[PDB]
Design a protein around this ligand. Sequence first.
Ligand code: HEM
Length: 148
Amino acid sequence: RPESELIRQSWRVVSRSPLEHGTVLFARLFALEPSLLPLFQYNGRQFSSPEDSLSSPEFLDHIRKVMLVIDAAVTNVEDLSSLEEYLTSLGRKHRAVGVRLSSFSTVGESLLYMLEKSLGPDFTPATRTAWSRLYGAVVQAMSRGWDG
Ligand code: HEM
C-alpha cells in the first residue's frame, strides 16, 4: 500500500519519544473531552484537573501502553487482522472501566492532532487519511468489546 508507508514514516517520528508524544495526545484528549478525566481511577481517586493526570505514574504508564498498542498497529499496518482478537478484549476492558466507545473517536482526533503537531508540513492530507484509516480499524476491532 502507499498508505502503509505513510503510516510507518510518520510514526517513526513519534515512536522515538512515545511518552512525550502520548502526553500531547492525552492533554489534547482532555481539552476536547474533559468528561474522560474521571475514568482514570488510580487508587480510587479522581483527577481534578487535567494537569493532575500528568503527575500520575499510573496515568503515564497508561500513555505508554496506548502508544504501544498503536505501535503494534503500525507494525501490523498491512494486515491488522492479527491484532483483532487482542483489540476486542482491549475494548472489553474499556467498557468495564466506563469509557463510552464514542470517546475513542476523541482519542482518534487526539492522535491526529499529535501527529499533525509533531510532523507539521510532513503531515499531509494523505497521511491524515491513512492514519484515520488505521486508527479507525483499531477502534472497529475494539468496538467489538462492546459487542455489536
Ligand atoms: C479513550 C479513553 C481511554 C481511557 C479513559 C482509558 C482508561 C483506561 C483505564 C482506566 C485502564 C485500566 C487502568 C490502567 O491499566 O491504566 C486502561 C487500560 C488500558 N488502556 Fe486505556 N483508556 C483509554 C484509551 C486507550 C486506548 C486508545 C488504548 C490503546 C490504543 C488504550 C490502551 C490501554 C491498555 C493497553 C490498557 C491495559 C489493559 C489491560 O489490562 O490489558 N487505552 N485504560
